[PDB]
Amino acid sequence: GHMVEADRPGKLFIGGLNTETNEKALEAVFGKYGRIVEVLLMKDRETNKSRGFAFVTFESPADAKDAARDMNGKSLDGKAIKVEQATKPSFE
Questions:
Q1: What residues contact residue 2 under an 8 Å CB cut-off, 6+ apart?
Q2: What positions are modified (N-acetylvaline)?
């Protein structure tokens, strides 16, 4: 057909995290802004500790954007966490 609907910034980018977290707990971090259907934790290789960064996705891009408009630059369990938009509006 015609299609000009190809934008969906449903991805976010998290930093500053704990070492002893899991994806089920990230549901409690961000799901309240607009529901999650995909979480990606990422870990070390030394001794399986979590690293101080992870990835969370949302069902909708309007639910993704909002999860970075309140929760950015706060504490979480006494660590200092971050959220950013890991995109740009256009790139060519």
A1: none
A2: 4
In order of start, what are the domains of the chain with their CATH numbers? 11-86 (3.30.70.330)
- Residue 11 three-state SS: strand
Q: How many CA atoms lie within 13 A of 56 on its CB side?
A: 29
Experimental method: NMR
In Å, what is the CA distance from 73 to each residue of 38, 47, 51, 80?
Answer: 22, 28, 18, 7
